[PDB]
Structure 1
Amino acid sequence: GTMVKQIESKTAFQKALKAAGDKLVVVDFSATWCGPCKMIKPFFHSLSEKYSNVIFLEVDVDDCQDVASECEVKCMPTFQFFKKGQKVGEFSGANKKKLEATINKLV
């Protein structure tokens, strides 16, 4: 029963960032064909349940080529972290340890 919101456009992305209010937002920039993305996706979804006070968004880079370019995603999965629409952290790679440590550092 995932809390992850699928983002399908640049407009949906901006509005999700604003809807977060003051809460940490974590965004997974992913693709359907990407092996490491597929490996970490269920863990990103489980974390969305573990951390009910953090907002979890998924952006498919083939769906949201505009979001991917603007957010300067070079490889997938990339995880970017926001507060009030503002980027407060980022890293690249399907790294479960780093993903959870970054949530805990930033929340």
Structure 2
Amino acid sequence: TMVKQIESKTAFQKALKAAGDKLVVVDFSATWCGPCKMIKPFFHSLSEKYSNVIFLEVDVDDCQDVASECEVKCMPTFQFFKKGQKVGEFSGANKKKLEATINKLV
């Protein structure tokens, strides 16, 4: 259990800076979203397998402001960060592409 919930743009930007030189994975999801429910367990399992990666969760229903600014059109969308920079992104509950993108950027 290493996934921290992001409830604000304040928290988001604080979390990104707190990350330092570590890869940051953000899961944009919703509670009513089927594909999101499928991959949620795996996303969380990945958090305590990739200890040198920072895992975050954003509920797009709570943070409609942030989801817009981040250009989430559908979920789950996964967005990847290093320093203060977006270094990767895909949308889809694709277990294979998620771990692959983690490895291709850590």
- Shorter-chain TM range is over 0.9
Q: Deviation at 1:42?
A: 0.6
CA RMSD for the aligned pairs? 0.5
TM-score normalised by the chain length of structure 2? 0.99
Residue ranges of structure 1 left out of the alignment (5+ in a row): none
Task: Give the deviation of 1:66 after TM superposition.
Answer: 1.2
DSSP 3-state at the match of 2:52: coil
Whole-angstrom CA distance in 1 between matches of 2:89 and 2:41:
20
Q: Which runs of 5+ in 2 are unaligned?
A: none
**1:35-64 Cα deviation digits (max 9, x unpaired):** 000000010000000000000000000111
Tell me the percent identity.
Answer: 100
Deviation at 1:85, TM superposition (A): 2.0
Offset at 1:80? 0.4
Counting matched residue pairs gives 106
Offset from partner CA, 1:13-32 (integer Å, 9 cap, x none): 11000100110000000000
Q: Deviations over 1:84-104 (max 9, x none)?
A: 121000000000000000000
Query: Post-superposition shift, 1:67?
Result: 1.1
1:67-82 correspondence runs (5 A)? 67-82=66-81
Displacement over 3 Å in runs of 4+: none
